[PDB]
Design a protein around this ligand. Structure first.
Ligand code: MG
Ligand code: MG
Ligand code: MG
Ligand code: MG
Ligand code: MG
Ligand code: MG
Ligand code: MG
Ligand code: MG
Lengths: 115, 238, 196
RNA sequence: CAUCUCAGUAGGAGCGGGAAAAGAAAUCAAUUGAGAUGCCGUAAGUAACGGCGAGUGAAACCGGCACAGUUCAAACCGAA
RNA sequence: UUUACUGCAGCCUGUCGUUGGGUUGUGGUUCUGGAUGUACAGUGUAGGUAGGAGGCAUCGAAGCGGGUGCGCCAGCAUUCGUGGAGCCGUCCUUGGGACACUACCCUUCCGGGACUACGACCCUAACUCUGAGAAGAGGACCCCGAUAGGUGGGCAGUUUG
């Protein structure tokens, strides 16, 4: 596919912050994966620096089969900082918008445009 | 186990069969040149090399480092050498064999590009350029065979100095003895039929004869390939 | 099915030749060939296998890629007179597997730690690679631990060079019970080495 | 005398403590039972192997000494 | 010591792994356009075989073309037409097989596309050599692990009453 523009990624990070302070987010590979499996994720954020790459390999096909909008993030450090954590987090997931629902749907539409 | 042979003793590398390396002046190789470079240099002296019994030239290059070089005939103290791709054809320069004309003599040819030179190096030998196809060039080696070399190979133009070294007979064991002190070879060598059956496949008996045929196949194990190794023919021409 | 990501990693490594792992093998083999015999790597290559074998994210736990050749015990032809049954040695493969060789080299490189387990991580025409999990017994984090303090004992020194690891007990013929193990328990030496 | 025997012996390399190794059934049984391990007795010079020659050679059942069971990985919570 | 008996190293060669991407010749594997199925012809082409026969047809069926699956330039299909009826067969071309639509499930036809194994050629990204390095030269060959066959007093254990 086509890698999303920078404004889209910044919008996703801002929505992550907003749902953090207001809603609910599962952050961590295991919790986010189980959230996707059950099916409640408003949006999935995944970093692209993982070595070994097997950590986040299964997320893409699983989300696309489950009809879940997944985005890609450049580095682990900023994703971890967004979640409210002093350590890097590989993948998070906006389980509950709380108040950032509008960013949820418009980021979904933007991802449909990019795909 | 009847004792090992001389060839296997050379294989182990005992001090009797090792070359006296500290006597030799220096290793002979072409100047190292990067892509699209051409360095020059003028001879400073002509010197004797004990590892080949032929002269070598000392050349000081523009960068500063001096190198011994395989001396082709006619090289004189003072002449400048122009090793590189853009060199003209003259006696002494180093040029690719692709742009050497047919009929010219060369020496110190390389196998693959940037080896420094491996063929045509003993005294007074030389090779010739025969044909120039697009992808290869055929040079007639001093043995008498045709070899297909890369067009981007380097070789000095001329013939190796010291020609005629073997027109002077030894006529003594002493002179040949003196040559052998600066080589790895052993002197003198006992003949196989005069040994005992432990020492060699041919030894033993009440009179000195080989007993078995001297021609040996190419598949014989180590410790048996003694004699005429896989000969195609024998005898002089009648 | 509500499944952890360790399960997905396990499935991906279940059949390496028929997933995305083959391409990763193609890239990784070059970098691995450039490296030495024993190398310290920060994270395990296969997370699920390591967690299964007793790996935790704490101080004092180390993981290492070892490199071992393929083939049998390279053996020399006897110099003197044998009896034509002991004369041949080209088809006589060893009696020690390759995981054991890998773990012993890793133990020889790290004189203060102790080997726990290992697992297969790749192979090509000349080499095999294993990862060995090593635990430091004199670190306070290990000492406080309740599931790992058994290694701070005077019977766990040299745990890999006496066949106490899992591969060691596989190679000692003590992976099972019952028929066939008459001469392999409680040790090979106890029966004049007629087992194995 | 060549498979066999001498014998996994002599010898070698590594590791290591007051002991070490083993140890809580993907077990042994036979119709239906037993219930971690080690060591001693017996089974027994029996089954089995073998120029079926010379020779090599067990285990289970049963009787004793002494007795002791547990800890992780994962599913659920997500830094507690 | 050897063309004594039995073996073992070394070397030569096949196969498997390391080992990838294309060019095409191979063969089925596998897939379509027609039952292609047709000599005692035929009004019919054995719509395999076959309820030994009954539904189709200006509300589409015919003879002919270079000939449309194909074959006996006949003729079942309605196809590009051409005339504007081939109907079943209890008129069976009374059959090698005698034939009618919801059956062709199957002589076959076989872009043979498709994964495969072979012989040859090409490419570079694995790999190998050279260089401090850029880079250069080879290249899925060689080396290497395993296995099968040969040669083998190079070497070992023995026998020669
Ligand atoms: Mg001899
Ligand atoms: Mg080492
Ligand atoms: Mg113990
Ligand atoms: Mg000690
Ligand atoms: Mg145990
Ligand atoms: Mg025995
Ligand atoms: Mg002999
Ligand atoms: Mg004897």
């Amino acid at each position: 596919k086509f890698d999303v523009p920078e404004e889209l990624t910044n919008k996703a990070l801002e929505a992550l912050e907003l749902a953090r302070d207001t809603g609910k987010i599962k952050k961590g590979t295991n919790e986010a994966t189980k959230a996707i499996e059950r099916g409640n994720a408003k949006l999935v954020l995944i970093a692209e620096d993982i070595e070994p790459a097997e950590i986040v390999a299964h997320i893409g096909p699983l989300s696309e089969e489950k009809k879940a909008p997944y985005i890609f993030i450049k580095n682990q450090k900023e994703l971890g900082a967004a979640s409210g954590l002093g350590v890097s987090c590989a993948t998070v997931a906006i389980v509950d918008a709380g108040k950032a629902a509008e960013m949820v749907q418009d980021i979904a539409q933007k991802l449909e445009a990019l795909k | 186990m009847g004792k090992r042979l001389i060839s296997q003793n050379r294989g182990r590398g005992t001090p009797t069969y090792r070359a006296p390396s500290h006597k030799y002046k220096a290793d002979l190789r072409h100047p190292r040149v990067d892509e699209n470079s051409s360095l020059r240099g003028e001879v400073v002296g002509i010197e004797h090399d004990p590892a080949r019994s032929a002269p070598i030239a000392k050349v000081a290059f523009e960068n500063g480092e001096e190198l011994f070089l395989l001396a082709s005939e006619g090289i004189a103290v003072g002449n400048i050498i122009e090793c590189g791709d853009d060199a003209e054809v003259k006696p002494g320069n180093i040029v690719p064999i692709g742009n050497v004309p047919e009929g010219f003599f060369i020496c110190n040819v390389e196998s693959k590009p940037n080896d420094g030179g491996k063929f045509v190096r003993s005294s007074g030998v030389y090779a010739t350029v025969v044909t120039h196809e697009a992808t290869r060039t055929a040079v007639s080696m001093p043995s008498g065979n045709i070899k297909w070399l890369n067009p981007k190979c380097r070789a000095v133009v001329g013939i190796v100095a010291g020609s005629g070294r073997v027109d002077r007979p030894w006529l003594k064991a002493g002179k040949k003895y003196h040559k052998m002190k600066t080589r790895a070879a052993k002197y003198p060598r006992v003949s196989a039929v005069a040994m005992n059956p432990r020492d060699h496949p041919f030894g033993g008996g009440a009179w000195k004869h080989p007993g078995k045929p001297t021609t040996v196949s190419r598949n014989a194990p180590p410790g048996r390939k003694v004699g005429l190794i896989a000969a195609r023919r024998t005898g002089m021409k009648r | 099915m509500v499944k952890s990501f360790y399960g997905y990693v396990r499935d991906a490594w279940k059949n390496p030749d028929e997933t995305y792992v083959n391409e990763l093998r193609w890239e990784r083999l070059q970098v691995w060939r450039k490296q030495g015999s024993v190398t310290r790597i920060e994270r395990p290559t296969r997370i699920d296998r390591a967690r299964s074998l007793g790996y935790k994210a704490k101080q004092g736990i180390v993981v290492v890629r070892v490199n071992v050749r393929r083939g049998g015990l390279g053996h020399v032809r006897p110099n003197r007179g044998r009896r034509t049954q002991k004369m041949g040695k080209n088809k006589v493969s060893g009696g020690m597997s390759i995981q054991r060789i890998a773990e012993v080299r890793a133990d020889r490189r790290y004189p203060n730690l102790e080997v726990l387990n290992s697992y297969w991580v790749g192979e090509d025409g000349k080499h095999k690679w294993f990862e060995v999990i090593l635990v430091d017994p004199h670190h306070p984090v290990i000492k406080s631990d309740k599931n790992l303090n058994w290694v701070c004992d005077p019977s766990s020194r040299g745990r890999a060079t006496r066949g106490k690891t899992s591969a060691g007990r596989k190679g000692r013929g003590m992976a099972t019970r019952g028929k066939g193990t008459e001469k392999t328990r409680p040790s090979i030496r106890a029966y004049k080495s007629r087992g194995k």
